Specification:
homohexamer, mainly beta, 8 strands, protein fibril, amyloid fibril, hexameric, Alpha-synuclein
Chain lengths: ~60, ~60, ~60, ~60, ~60, ~60
């Protein structure tokens, strides 16, 4: 398999993840896993086999 | 298999994920998994085999 | 397998992850895992085999 | 004459003058005169007598 | 004449004059005259008599 | 004449004049005259008599 990526750009601005939170009490931000950000972002074969990517969060309150 | 991607652009602006929350109490933001953001974003063969990507969250309150 | 990435750009600005939180009490930020940020961001074969990437957080309050 | 001004406020945000210009060639911004901006802005007896406030601009092109 | 100004505020943000210009060639910014900016901005008797405030600009091109 | 100004504030932020210019060739910024900026900004009797405040700029191109 052959994968060819050609990018010819001018004045590129990229904003991957932006989270804004205010006037709360409990704030939990969980950013992770496989995040690719940029002008030429390529993600090939992220997981192979029995692998796993969780990027999980849990909230428990009593 | 052959995959050809050709991008010729000028003045490109990309905003992948933007979350805004205010005037709450409990705020849980879970951003993850396989997120590709950018001017030339290519995602080929993200999962192969018995793999898995969760990117899961859970809220429990009593 | 052959993977070719060619980037020819001018005046590129990339913002990967930006989190803003204010006027709260409890704030937990967990950024990790496999985060690739930049003008030419390539992520190939992040996980191979029985590996795993958690990037997980948990909130417990009684 | 008696002038009474009483302001009791919380979390006040004031934006007086905001000018945005882009993708032009000739841009002339003239901001002046008697501009009062703020949470408690009072303007009493700006001009008295034969006075004058111009705050004027002129564009000539041949 | 009696002028009473009473300001009782909390967390005040004031932006008087904001000018943004881009992707032009000729840019002339003229900010002046009588500009009062702030949380408690009072302007009383700016001009008295035969006085004058110009705050003027002129563009000539041949 | 009696002028009373009373300011009782907490966490005050003031931005008087902000000019941003980019991607131009000719840029002329003229800020002056009578500019009062601050948390408690008072401007009384700026001009008296036959006085004048210009704060003027001129652009000539052939």
């Amino acid at each position: 398999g052959v994968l060819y990526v050609g990018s010819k750009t001018k004045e590129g601005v990229v904003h991957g993840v932006a989270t804004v939170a205010e006037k709360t009490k409990e704030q939990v931000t969980n950013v992770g896993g496989a995040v690719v950000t940029g002008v030429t972002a390529v993600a090939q074969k992220t997981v192979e086999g029995a692998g796993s990517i969780a990027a999980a969060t849990g909230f428990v309150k009593k």
